[PDB]
Amino acid sequence: GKCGPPPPIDNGDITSFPLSVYAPASSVEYQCQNLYQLEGNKRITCRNGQWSEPPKCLHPCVISREIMENYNIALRWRAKQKLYSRTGESVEFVCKRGYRLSSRSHTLRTTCWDGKLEYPTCAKR
Protein backbone atom coordinates (compact mmCIF):
# COMPACT_ATOMS: atom_id res chain seq x y z
CA GLY A 1 0.00 0.00 0.00
CA LYS A 2 3.01 2.39 -0.19
CA CYS A 3 2.86 5.49 -2.33
CA GLY A 4 5.40 7.28 -4.45
CA PRO A 5 5.85 11.02 -4.06
CA PRO A 6 2.56 13.05 -3.79
CA PRO A 7 1.43 14.70 -7.06
CA PRO A 8 3.11 17.85 -8.22
CA ILE A 9 0.80 20.89 -8.32
CA ASP A 10 1.30 24.03 -10.35
CA ASN A 11 2.60 26.96 -8.35
CA GLY A 12 2.84 25.16 -5.04
CA ASP A 13 4.47 22.17 -3.31
CA ILE A 14 4.64 20.24 -0.09
CA THR A 15 5.85 21.81 3.18
CA SER A 16 7.86 18.74 4.45
CA PHE A 17 11.14 17.10 3.66
CA PRO A 18 10.46 14.98 0.54
CA LEU A 19 10.35 11.18 0.59
CA SER A 20 10.62 8.84 -2.39
CA VAL A 21 8.16 6.39 -0.90
CA TYR A 22 5.46 6.91 1.75
CA ALA A 23 3.87 4.39 4.13
CA PRO A 24 0.11 3.99 4.03
CA ALA A 25 -1.59 6.44 6.33
CA SER A 26 1.06 9.08 5.61
CA SER A 27 -0.08 12.55 4.82
CA VAL A 28 1.47 15.66 3.35
CA GLU A 29 0.58 19.39 3.41
CA TYR A 30 0.72 21.68 0.40
CA GLN A 31 1.40 25.45 0.34
CA CYS A 32 0.98 27.65 -2.70
CA GLN A 33 3.57 30.22 -3.68
CA ASN A 34 3.11 33.72 -2.37
CA LEU A 35 0.88 35.31 -4.95
CA TYR A 36 -1.30 32.19 -5.30
CA GLN A 37 -4.21 30.93 -3.12
CA LEU A 38 -4.84 27.26 -2.21
CA GLU A 39 -8.17 25.81 -3.17
CA GLY A 40 -9.09 22.23 -2.04
CA ASN A 41 -7.69 20.09 0.72
CA LYS A 42 -4.35 21.42 2.06
CA ARG A 43 -3.55 17.99 3.53
CA ILE A 44 -3.82 14.76 1.48
CA THR A 45 -3.19 11.13 2.49
CA CYS A 46 -1.65 7.94 1.09
CA ARG A 47 -4.16 5.09 1.48
CA ASN A 48 -4.66 1.96 -0.59
CA GLY A 49 -1.50 2.83 -2.57
CA GLN A 50 -2.81 6.15 -3.78
CA TRP A 51 -2.84 9.81 -2.85
CA SER A 52 -6.08 11.62 -2.22
CA GLU A 53 -6.76 14.53 -4.61
CA PRO A 54 -4.20 17.35 -4.38
CA PRO A 55 -5.35 21.01 -4.10
CA LYS A 56 -4.87 23.73 -6.71
CA CYS A 57 -3.12 27.15 -6.60
CA LEU A 58 -5.43 29.91 -7.89
CA HIS A 59 -3.70 32.67 -9.93
CA PRO A 60 -3.10 36.29 -9.13
CA CYS A 61 -4.46 39.02 -11.38
CA VAL A 62 -2.23 41.46 -13.25
CA ILE A 63 -3.74 45.01 -13.34
CA SER A 64 -4.21 46.26 -16.90
CA ARG A 65 -3.31 49.85 -17.73
CA GLU A 66 -4.91 49.37 -21.16
CA ILE A 67 -8.37 48.34 -19.87
CA MET A 68 -8.23 51.21 -17.37
CA GLU A 69 -7.40 53.61 -20.24
CA ASN A 70 -10.31 52.23 -22.36
CA TYR A 71 -12.82 52.42 -19.49
CA ASN A 72 -11.85 55.95 -18.34
CA ILE A 73 -10.79 54.90 -14.87
CA ALA A 74 -7.77 55.07 -12.64
CA LEU A 75 -6.60 53.33 -9.47
CA ARG A 76 -7.82 55.00 -6.22
CA TRP A 77 -4.30 54.35 -4.79
CA ARG A 78 -1.82 54.87 -7.60
CA ALA A 79 1.28 55.20 -5.43
CA LYS A 80 0.43 52.10 -3.26
CA GLN A 81 -1.03 49.58 -5.64
CA LYS A 82 0.93 46.49 -6.62
CA LEU A 83 0.79 45.30 -10.24
CA TYR A 84 -0.26 41.83 -8.99
CA SER A 85 -3.28 41.25 -6.78
CA ARG A 86 -4.02 37.92 -5.14
CA THR A 87 -7.17 35.86 -5.58
CA GLY A 88 -9.67 37.22 -3.08
CA GLU A 89 -8.13 40.75 -3.00
CA SER A 90 -10.13 43.73 -4.14
CA VAL A 91 -8.95 46.69 -6.13
CA GLU A 92 -10.47 50.17 -5.78
CA PHE A 93 -10.84 52.51 -8.77
CA VAL A 94 -11.97 56.06 -9.46
CA CYS A 95 -13.32 57.69 -12.63
CA LYS A 96 -10.86 59.88 -14.44
CA ARG A 97 -11.33 63.63 -13.98
CA GLY A 98 -14.53 64.79 -15.60
CA TYR A 99 -16.01 61.30 -16.07
CA ARG A 100 -18.75 59.54 -14.01
CA LEU A 101 -19.65 56.01 -13.28
CA SER A 102 -21.75 54.36 -15.95
CA SER A 103 -25.22 53.01 -14.97
CA ARG A 104 -24.51 49.43 -16.04
CA SER A 105 -20.95 49.28 -14.75
CA HIS A 106 -20.05 47.62 -11.62
CA THR A 107 -19.24 50.07 -8.83
CA LEU A 108 -15.69 51.20 -8.18
CA ARG A 109 -14.34 48.08 -6.27
CA THR A 110 -13.82 44.66 -7.86
CA THR A 111 -12.25 41.38 -6.70
CA CYS A 112 -9.50 39.25 -8.27
CA TRP A 113 -10.26 35.53 -8.72
CA ASP A 114 -7.86 33.07 -10.26
CA GLY A 115 -6.45 35.50 -12.86
CA LYS A 116 -9.71 37.34 -13.67
CA LEU A 117 -10.41 40.85 -12.49
CA GLU A 118 -13.39 42.89 -13.78
CA TYR A 119 -13.15 46.64 -14.19
CA PRO A 120 -15.74 49.39 -13.72
CA THR A 121 -16.48 51.87 -16.59
CA CYS A 122 -16.98 55.65 -16.51
CA ALA A 123 -18.44 57.90 -19.22
CA LYS A 124 -17.82 61.64 -19.85
CA ARG A 125 -19.87 64.06 -17.74
Swiss-Prot record:
Changing residue 82 to A: About 50% loss of C3b binding. It is found in: Secreted. Changing residue 76 to A: About 50% loss of C3b binding. Disulfide bonds join 3-46, 32-57, 61-112, 95-122. Expressed in the retinal pigment epithelium (at protein level). CFH is one of the most abundant complement components in blood where the liver is the major source of CFH protein in vivo. in addition, CFH is secreted by additional cell types including monocytes, fibroblasts, or endothelial cells. Changing residue 77 to L: In AHUS1; about 40% loss of C3b binding. Sulfated on tyrosine residues. Another study observed glycosylation at this position. Changing residue 80 to A: About 20% loss of C3b binding. Residues 1-59, 64-124 form the Sushi domain. Transmembrane segments: none annotated. Homodimer. Also forms homooligomers. Interacts with complement protein C3b; this interaction inhibits complement activation. Interacts with complement protein C3d. Interacts with CR3/ITGAM; this interaction mediates adhesion of neutrophils to pathogens leading to pathogen clearance. Interacts with complement factor I. It is linked to Basal laminar drusen: Drusen are extracellular deposits that accumulate below the retinal pigment epithelium on Bruch membrane. Basal laminar drusen refers to an early adult-onset drusen phenotype that shows a pattern of uniform small, slightly raised yellow subretinal nodules randomly scattered in the macula. In later stages, these drusen often become more numerous, with clustered groups of drusen scattered throughout the retina. In time these small basal laminar drusen may expand and ultimately lead to a serous pigment epithelial detachment of the macula that may result in vision loss. Sushi 1-3 domain represents the minimal unit capable of cofactor activity. The property to discriminate self surfaces from non-self surfaces depends on the C-terminal region made of Sushis 19-20. Glycoprotein that plays an essential role in maintaining a well-balanced immune response by modulating complement activation. Acts as a soluble inhibitor of complement, where its binding to self markers such as glycan structures prevents complement activation and amplification on cell surfaces. Accelerates the decay of the complement alternative pathway (AP) C3 convertase C3bBb, thus preventing local formation of more C3b, the central player of the complement amplification loop. As a cofactor of the serine protease factor I, CFH also regulates proteolytic degradation of already-deposited C3b. This is Complement factor H. The lineage of its organism: Eukaryota, Metazoa, Chordata, Craniata, Vertebrata.
